[PDB]
Amino acid sequence: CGDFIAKLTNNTHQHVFDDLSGSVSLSWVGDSTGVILVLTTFQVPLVIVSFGQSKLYRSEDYGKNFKDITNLINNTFIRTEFGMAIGPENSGKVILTAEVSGGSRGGRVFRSSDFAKNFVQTDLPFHPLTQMMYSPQNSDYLLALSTENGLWVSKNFGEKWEEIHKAVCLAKWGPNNIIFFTTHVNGSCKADLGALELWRTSDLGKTFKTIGVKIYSFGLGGRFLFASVMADTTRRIHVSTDQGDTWSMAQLPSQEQFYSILAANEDMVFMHVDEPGDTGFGTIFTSDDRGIVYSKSLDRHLYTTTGGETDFTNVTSLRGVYITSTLSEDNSIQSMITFDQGGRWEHLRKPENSKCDKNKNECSLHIHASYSISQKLNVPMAPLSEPNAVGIVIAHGSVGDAISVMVPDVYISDDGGYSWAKMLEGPHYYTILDSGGIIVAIEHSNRPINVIKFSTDEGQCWQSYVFTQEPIYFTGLASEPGARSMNISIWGFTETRQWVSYTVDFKDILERNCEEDDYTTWLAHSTDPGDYKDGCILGYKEQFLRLRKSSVCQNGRDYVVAKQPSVCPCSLEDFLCDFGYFRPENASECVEQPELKGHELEFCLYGKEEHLTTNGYRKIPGDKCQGGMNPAREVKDLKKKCTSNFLN
Amino acid sequence: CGDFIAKLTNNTHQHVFDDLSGSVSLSWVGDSTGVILVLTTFQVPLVIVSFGQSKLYRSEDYGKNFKDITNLINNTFIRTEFGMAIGPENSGKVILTAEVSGGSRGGRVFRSSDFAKNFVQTDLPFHPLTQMMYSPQNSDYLLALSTENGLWVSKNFGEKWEEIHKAVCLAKWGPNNIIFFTTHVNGSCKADLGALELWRTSDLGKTFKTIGVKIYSFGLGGRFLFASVMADTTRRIHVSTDQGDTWSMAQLPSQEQFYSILAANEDMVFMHVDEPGDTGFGTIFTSDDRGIVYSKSLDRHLYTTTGGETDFTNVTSLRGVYITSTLSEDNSIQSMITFDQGGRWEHLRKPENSKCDKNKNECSLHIHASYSISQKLNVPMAPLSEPNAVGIVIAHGSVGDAISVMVPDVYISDDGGYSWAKMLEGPHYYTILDSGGIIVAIEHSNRPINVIKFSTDEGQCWQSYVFTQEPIYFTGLASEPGARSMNISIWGFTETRQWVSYTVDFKDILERNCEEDDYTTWLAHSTDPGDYKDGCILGYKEQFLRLRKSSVCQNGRDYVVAKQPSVCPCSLEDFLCDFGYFRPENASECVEQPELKGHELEFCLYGKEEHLTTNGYRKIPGDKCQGGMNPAREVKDLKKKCTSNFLN
Ligand SMILES: *[C@@H]1O[C@H](CO)[C@@H](O[C@@H]2O[C@H](CO)[C@@H](O[C@@H]3O[C@H](CO)[C@@H](O)[C@H](O)[C@@H]3O)[C@H](O)[C@H]2NC(C)=O)[C@H](O)[C@H]1NC(C)=O
Ligand SMILES: *[C@@H]1O[C@H](CO)[C@@H](O[C@@H]2O[C@H](CO)[C@@H](O[C@@H]3O[C@H](CO)[C@@H](O)[C@H](O)[C@@H]3O)[C@H](O)[C@H]2NC(C)=O)[C@H](O)[C@H]1NC(C)=O
Ligand SMILES: *[C@@H]1O[C@H](CO)[C@@H](O[C@@H]2O[C@H](CO)[C@@H](O[C@@H]3O[C@H](CO)[C@@H](O)[C@H](O)[C@@H]3O)[C@H](O)[C@H]2NC(C)=O)[C@H](O)[C@H]1NC(C)=O
Ligand SMILES: *[C@@H]1O[C@H](CO)[C@@H](O[C@@H]2O[C@H](CO)[C@@H](O[C@@H]3O[C@H](CO)[C@@H](O)[C@H](O)[C@@H]3O)[C@H](O)[C@H]2NC(C)=O)[C@H](O)[C@H]1NC(C)=O
Ligand SMILES: *[C@@H]1O[C@H](CO)[C@@H](O)[C@H](O)[C@H]1NC(C)=O
Ligand SMILES: *[C@@H]1O[C@H](CO)[C@@H](O)[C@H](O)[C@H]1NC(C)=O
């Protein structure tokens, strides 16, 4: 790689908080408002009334000075489990949900509509079981669940509440202020698992519509509405794209299996299926634009026995990139990555400049996510990435040795995960701001720390800055919202403990705007060899930018050239495997599954028996390729009517 | 209350361990053998083959010096989940279960029959899924479950392994070397919940017997065998006292409720039943000497929604004493204690000399146990008691303030939980040795520590001793086994971390034997007023001893006078409430349940319809009172045969 102190010392702002008990929370509120709220919270069970008092501080000068405003919430306290209830980014809505320290017949909330500058008190006609839920369509609409399983809505932002149903088990918002929720009759929700009923409301609670029966669970994802249904006993999954008017059971090749949705968009659906026997690993399947017909996409996917957590991450810094973790035939764990939205996975390339090279399964990079947390491994954070920071991925990774599993390191990718480099030794808390101009990490240890590690050139070069002469036990790291933000907030405590917050500003470090000479063009990776598809991602070609090495300048432009997307010709990577086909390890072409050979491929689609005839290729939902490779397929109707639905 | 340093500094033995990875475990092996093992373990998923090496140190001088014996276990490693497998106290058996560092087709064990002084290496014909399991009747027999759900046994202390059944979900030893397990057929055990089968072997695996069908789960306790059965769907609990030859369904007063067993011994059985509605509280029922006929004992019993953990605790330091935590009418958590084996519960007396006196529910002592851990409160250890140390109880407690909940304190009872006293500020790890003569505790914090707190007068006076000028981060505290043990072991590390263990010996502190002038007589508490039953516990009267205040002497005698138990006359406290009756709050007499008044009390006992007629009193199983109060009851047979069994 290859003065910076005075730039940060003049912009390091400290503030000490005295006599704080319990857990300490800190949240910037909105973009470029200077509002930071610090909140004391306490771990108290939900059905218990306890005596306690939450301290509440508000800054309006970007972490310089804080004003105690606890008088606003006198005689109340905030559960850690709840915390704050911030709304959308530019909505200025902030709710604080609390309980009356003496106890009351109802909860008490503090609603702000001006980025926490002025609050009004409103007492609740119930005890809230779960936090407030904003409608994504309308910040003024709110709902939450009572401790008596009652569903409460407000049309005027928590001022006037109305109870709309009394037997509710779960409730989640939908598009256009539609609310879905399960209900029952006999006893408890835990008792009537498999006999619930799924309802829908288009009128905030005026009218209802029962969309389903014999329900075990439900959930949302992208343009899909999911519901697990029990026929008696066995359990099967159904999907609807029309907010529950019409359903169809999901169709898989190859009983008594357990299902799990991994993600979903406006395009497709990732579903994981445990291998019979509950062996510890399963199979991922991918759906079409309707989310009905599923095909094998990745074998031997690890999941935690208790919980089902998986290393599956949606890499936000590159479209159509997902990384997960799988079990090799030698029973060594491997990180897999797809660049074509689950069309074809590839082993994660070992990191350059780290020649481990003994055993072959050894020295492979494993990236740590939700499975690795679940196995109680020393991983402070999941893989982090921001949409604005194209190509930048930061995560925790390990070599094939049990010593490196106990002490993971921080790796950085600049190309959506194609190439990796160990950048920090040992675990760290990281965050991304400035649209990727600034990368800040902070060591995670049992000893007090006082070292900020940051990076201005997309993680390629790092530098350390001691922000205080008094090391503090680390507690939290918050970044200011905004694409061009340069303000962070670190808080912790000393040793009766004394909390303290430092607001560091990178204004004087990044004062010069970057010119075109500080950027360097680079294309995304394409699994298909040759230049003819170099940079093609689901049929679109886009050129990218990147900060040079040791670049210390403020970016004002987006990393996409925004010239024009040129359409690429269709190739293998632009197609998923069809129903009954899969791609074997390291392989590029799809082949029929062994157990289905010589048998007629049949499935059931919206109460119809359908016969499939393919070359084994299905266009990727969302792929925009044209011309080139064009594998055919046909879906003809049959005679039988079949039964593809277990609800009405 | 009202020199001690030289007595401990000369007896503090430090040993430094260099270059250790992973978790560190430390254990004494046997009574007065001076064998201490130290083991390195690693957090690796069970299904993964990883490369690793577990370090292993033996001391045979009670902690003074340790010999690295890792070469005994070269090229293997031990999982943290497995740790050691120590047999019975005086058996001398030690197993070390490990996996081959490269991966293998079996595990590999290291067996020792001589208090860990010599080990033999044996390879397993299977990957162990669960740790080894000794038979309580014969320490030579072991058994274990393989990763392929294979049940394996050994009649010759893990030397020769034999697979006796291949579809085993769970298996558990029994009296006289009998083995219980569950089997299935279709798919996984997770898929055959409610369709399992319960089997039994008296011949270590030669002969089998299917004792129950349609099984959900099962367990052992005291002289009872339990088994949750599914009817279709609904779930009911069955009990058998004859190792599974004849069963009966449990009989409760007052559908689709969730059952749980709390404890059970050679006399009676404690059951918890979630209130319909999964409201976060339930109701405790006790049985008779046959484990069938249940009767309300404590209402509004708190349980954790996810997992069902409760605060129930068996004060093994006093016969007939148990403590748990209930939800008052004021939604405040309260500790409730019984001194008559669940016959009549009483609020836990607030501590003296701590005149908190604001609110009535406030200043109530809440004792933290399993429910409080489930709720993730800052509680390092549960209540601790030793049957050798009569009356001694130590645990973690709180006032009704949310601040005090966050930082619990440690309280002490010398009278079996009748009276309590705040003795230490803040959470601590604590432990008991010398049969109550020495009580040691260690601060629980983020900062490294170097201070031991100990007490030589059964918790009444305390004293600190700084055992090292090099503070260390705390990890573990172990005592030497024995009735008169005086050696402890403290281990932790500095900051690449460096582990270190200190063996402190209280020989020079307790050199003078206690005479009779150092003891003071005291009787146990009896709920019934008056002296005529003062000291009566389930019909037996026994006088107790106690060390005076500020007593620093070595006890050589047991705290029970062992004169002779005099039988007490029967009173209320010596009777449980009958079927359909209960004792209300603060109340002494049993009354019929409201919903059963005017209705004929009927239940079903071993396929018989039985009609009950009582005054509402049932002799306590194990109560030895004679004469005095004698409430009658009658159980007459009827005409109907009824159906009290779902397993054939
Ligand atoms: C990131 O941090 C910088 C601080 O280095 C923030 O800049 C601060 O912006 C406020 C806006 O209120 C400045 O206060 C005043 O704004 C009024 C607007 O009428 C203006 O007339 C005054 O002259 C003054 O600028 C504040 O001075 C400025 N900070 C410093 C240290 O000067 C910035 O807003 C933060 N967040 C981002 C970039 O979103
Ligand atoms: C998986 O991650 C990718 C990026 O990692 C996510 O892709 C992003 O999806 C969102 C919503 O589909 C897109 O937002 C867009 O907002 C504009 C605002 O005007 C709107 O007009 C568009 O209709 C769309 O909603 C976003 O552009 C897109 N990212 C990129 C790079 O294009 C994806 O949603 C994540 N989850 C999946 C695939 O389920
Ligand atoms: C832990 O406590 C024990 C007592 O509970 C201390 O006892 C030590 O025991 C050993 C024997 O294992 C004594 O050594 C000798 O035993 C032989 C017989 O084999 C005998 O002929 C000798 O006369 C002698 O007794 C040793 O003396 C004894 N230690 C002391 C200080 O007397 C043990 O020392 C305690 N742990 C620590 C770390 O001090
Ligand atoms: C609460 O703790 C007490 C501690 O005593 C539990 O144990 C019961 O204790 C007595 C005395 O130790 C046991 O005596 C038995 O002695 C015979 C021979 O004299 C022996 O064969 C037995 O194996 C046993 O040691 C009694 O059986 C024991 N209960 C059990 C589980 O065996 C009491 O069980 C605990 N609370 C409950 C109600 O579970
Ligand atoms: C696939 O390629 C990887 C290296 O990229 C190699 O370790 C593995 O053995 C190959 N597997 C097969 C089945 O070809
Ligand atoms: C029971 O006694 C406790 C104090 O031991 C008291 O606080 C409570 O109000 C009493 N309740 C009833 C119903 O008598």
Numbering used by the authors:
A (entry chain B), B (entry chain A): 53 to 54, 58 to 287, 290 to 311, 314 to 416, 420 to 557, 561 to 713
What do the study's own words say?
Sortilin can trigger internalization of ligands from the cell surface via endocytosis and sorts ligands between several intracellular compartments, such as the trans-Golgi network (TGN), endosomes, lysosomes, and the secretory pathway. Sortilin binds and sorts a broad range of ligands, and dysfunction of sortilin has been linked to a wide range of disorders. Previously solved crystal structures of s-sortilin revealed that the Vps10p domain in fact consists of three domains; a ten-bladed β-propeller and two 10CC domains (10CC-a and 10CC-b) that have substantial interactions with the β-propeller. In this study, we detail that sortilin undergoes a conformational change within the three luminal domains and dimerizes while transitioning from neutral to acidic pH.
We determined the structures of the glycosylated luminal segment of mouse sortilin, s-sortilin, from crystals grown at neutral pH (pH 7.5, one crystal form, 2.1 Å maximum resolution) and acidic pH (pH ranging from 5.0 to 6.2, three crystal forms, maximum resolution ranging from 2.3 to 4.0 Å). The structures reveal two distinct conformations, a monomer at neutral pH and a dimer at acidic pH. The eight independent s-sortilin molecules in the three crystal forms grown at acidic pH all form homodimers with an identical interface and highly similar structure. The r.m.s.d. between the s-sortilin chains in the dimers is 0.80 Å for all of the 650 Cα atoms modeled. S-sortilin dimerizes through the top face of the β-propeller, i.e., the large side of the β-propeller disk opposite to the bottom face at which the 10CC domains are located. The predominantly hydrophobic dimer interface is large with a buried surface area of 4882 Å2 and is formed mainly by loops protruding from the blades. β-Propeller blades 1, 4, 6, 7, 8, 9, and 10 are involved in dimer formation. In the s-sortilin dimer the C-termini are in close proximity to each other with 37 Å distance between the two N713 Cα atoms. The s-sortilin dimer structures, crystallized at acidic pH, reveal that dimerization is accompanied by a substantial conformational rearrangement within the ß-propeller and two 10CC domains. Despite three internal disulfide bonds in 10CC-b, the three α-helices that form a small hydrophobic core in the s-sortilin monomer change their conformation into a three-stranded β-sheet in the dimer. In the monomer conformation, the s-sortilin C-terminus is exposed and pointing away from the β-propeller; whereas in the dimer conformation, it is interacting, through conserved hydrophobic interactions, with the rim of the β-propeller at blades 4 and 5.
